[PDB]
Scaffold this active site. Structure first.
Site, PDB file in Angstrom:
ATOM      1  CB  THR A  44      -0.884   0.049   1.215  1.00 51.25           C
ATOM      2  OG1 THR A  44      -0.090   0.406   2.355  1.00 51.25           O
ATOM      3  CG2 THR A  44      -1.521  -1.330   1.446  1.00 51.25           C
ATOM      4  CB  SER A  45       0.049   4.597  -1.126  1.00 49.31           C
ATOM      5  OG  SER A  45      -1.288   4.400  -0.743  1.00 49.31           O
TER       6      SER A  45
ATOM      7  CG  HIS B 182       6.459  -0.149   1.948  1.00 51.57           C
ATOM      8  ND1 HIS B 182       5.757  -0.306   3.125  1.00 51.57           N
ATOM      9  CD2 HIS B 182       5.568   0.306   1.035  1.00 51.57           C
ATOM     10  CE1 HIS B 182       4.496   0.042   2.931  1.00 51.57           C
ATOM     11  NE2 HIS B 182       4.357   0.417   1.671  1.00 51.57           N
ATOM     12  N   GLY B 183      10.350  -1.298   3.648  1.00 53.08           N
ATOM     13  CA  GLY B 183      11.612  -1.992   3.697  1.00 53.08           C
ATOM     14  C   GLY B 183      11.574  -3.317   4.433  1.00 53.08           C
TER      15      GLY B 183
ATOM     16  CB  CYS C  29       9.580  -2.180   7.892  1.00 54.32           C
ATOM     17  SG  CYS C  29       8.180  -1.180   8.490  1.00 54.32           S
TER      18      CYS C  29
HETATM   19  C1  LIG Z   1       7.379  -0.717   6.912  1.00 57.46           C
HETATM   20  O1  LIG Z   1       7.984   0.518   6.490  1.00 57.46           O
HETATM   21  C2  LIG Z   1       7.350  -1.731   5.788  1.00 57.46           C
HETATM   22  O2  LIG Z   1       8.374  -2.093   5.199  1.00 57.46           O
HETATM   23  N1  LIG Z   1       6.050  -2.175   5.536  1.00 57.46           N
HETATM   24  C3  LIG Z   1       5.670  -3.358   4.765  1.00 57.46           C
HETATM   25  C4  LIG Z   1       5.160  -1.282   6.262  1.00 57.46           C
HETATM   26  C5  LIG Z   1       5.967  -0.517   7.106  1.00 57.46           C
HETATM   27  C6  LIG Z   1       5.429   0.481   7.978  1.00 57.46           C
HETATM   28  C7  LIG Z   1       4.013   0.716   7.916  1.00 57.46           C
HETATM   29  S1  LIG Z   1       3.248   1.984   8.968  1.00 57.46           S
HETATM   30  O3  LIG Z   1       4.203   2.990   9.326  1.00 57.46           O
HETATM   31  O4  LIG Z   1       2.003   2.342   8.401  1.00 57.46           O
HETATM   32  N2  LIG Z   1       2.687   1.280  10.481  1.00 57.46           N
HETATM   33  C8  LIG Z   1       3.730   0.781  11.385  1.00 57.46           C
HETATM   34  C9  LIG Z   1       3.631  -0.728  11.500  1.00 57.46           C
HETATM   35  C10 LIG Z   1       2.219  -1.077  11.084  1.00 57.46           C
HETATM   36  C11 LIG Z   1       1.677   0.187  10.423  1.00 57.46           C
HETATM   37  C12 LIG Z   1       0.269   0.532  11.055  1.00 57.46           C
HETATM   38  O5  LIG Z   1      -0.508   1.754  10.807  1.00 57.46           O
HETATM   39  C13 LIG Z   1      -0.779   2.185   9.478  1.00 57.46           C
HETATM   40  C14 LIG Z   1      -1.356   1.301   8.504  1.00 57.46           C
HETATM   41  C15 LIG Z   1      -1.663   1.757   7.185  1.00 57.46           C
HETATM   42  C16 LIG Z   1      -1.399   3.101   6.830  1.00 57.46           C
HETATM   43  C17 LIG Z   1      -0.827   3.997   7.794  1.00 57.46           C
HETATM   44  C18 LIG Z   1      -0.519   3.540   9.109  1.00 57.46           C
HETATM   45  C19 LIG Z   1       3.189  -0.066   7.034  1.00 57.46           C
HETATM   46  C20 LIG Z   1       3.754  -1.078   6.208  1.00 57.46           C
END
Ligand SMILES: *[C@@]1(=O)C(=O)N([C])C2=C1[C]=C(S(=O)(=O)N1[C][C][C][C]1[C]OC1=[C][C]=[C][C]=[C]1)[C]=[C]2
Lengths: 93, 145
Positions: B34-35, B93-94, B135
């Site tokens: 997702t974005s 993303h990572g 991540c």
């Molecule tokens: C992380 O950077 C990565 O590699 N992936 C797959 C991913 C990562 C962080 C996030 S996030 O910052 O959105 N957030 C932290 C961990 C779970 C998530 C939860 O809240 C959220 C969900 C969707 C949009 C915005 C916030 C997501 C994916």
């Protein structure tokens, strides 16, 4: 005469290895939010690693995730300073 | 002259260094990702911050794993002779070791390698800084109150 080729590189990771890296849909990521805060407040006072260490406590202590999903609710985060630099770093002079 | 210590990098070169910021927000339907939202604030933020730090900022939005690599290979090929440093911000993303281009993953080593002391001559002895907002896996720090 020679120096490591991986020498003089600095890795500022937003998180400890293996963990999630929080981002807030409105205000931005915890890390870059806190990194920019500290840079402007000390880039002309502290050596880079001392700055990034303030950046670590800002994230660690001031932020904590909110979420309708228990799984992701109430989480903390600690950025990771990874330095292979051989000298101190001051953006000013 | 007098005693000459040298515990800090020469940061008085004609230029402070060019700062590359890669702002990946949107991913190809295929990646199954997702974005990222909020990232545009992050990206704007760094630009303002590094601009104050006399850094020559170059924002690069939604890059493919291929454009990231070319960008890097190309930027590394530049002559950084009159520059004190090099910053590079990867917003995406990572996973441990990799950051995602808009279509696929890129290995942190694959790109930071264009700048190794022997592959980026005009940056040898100079500080190469990589800031990474992504991540490094999927663990959650429940913290300790
Ligand atoms: C992380 O950077 C990565 O590699 N992936 C797959 C991913 C990562 C962080 C996030 S996030 O910052 O959105 N957030 C932290 C961990 C779970 C998530 C939860 O809240 C959220 C969900 C969707 C949009 C915005 C916030 C997501 C994916």
């Amino acid at each position: 005469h020679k120096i490591p080729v991986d020498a003089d590189f600095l890795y500022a990771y937003s998180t400890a290895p293996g963990y999630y890296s929080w981002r807030n849909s409105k205000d931005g990521s915890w890390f870059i939010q806190s990194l920019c805060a500290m840079l402007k407040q000390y880039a002309d006072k502290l050596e880079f690693m001392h700055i990034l260490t303030r950046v670590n406590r800002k994230v660690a202590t001031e932020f904590e995730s909110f979420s309708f999903d228990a799984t992701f609710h109430a989480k903390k985060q600690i950025p990771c300073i990874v330095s292979m630099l051989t000298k101190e770093l001051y953006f000013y002079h | 002259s007098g005693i000459s210590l040298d515990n800090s990098y020469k940061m008085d070169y004609p230029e402070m260094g060019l700062c590359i910021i890669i702002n990946n927000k949107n991913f190809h339907k295929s990646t199954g990702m997702t974005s990222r939202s909020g990232t545009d604030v992050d990206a704007a933020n760094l630009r303002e911050t590094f601009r104050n730090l006399k850094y020559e900022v170059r924002n690069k939005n939604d890059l493919t794993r291929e454009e990231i690599v070319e960008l890097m290979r190309d930027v590394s090929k530049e002559d950084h002779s009159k520059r004190s440093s090099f910053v590079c911000v990867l917003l995406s993303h990572g996973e441990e070791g990799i950051i995602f281009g808009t279509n696929g993953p890129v290995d942190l080593k694959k790109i930071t390698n264009f700048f190794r002391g022997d592959r980026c001559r005009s940056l040898t002895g100079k500080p190469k800084l990589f800031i990474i907002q992504a991540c490094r896996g999927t663990e959650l720090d429940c913290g300790i109150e």
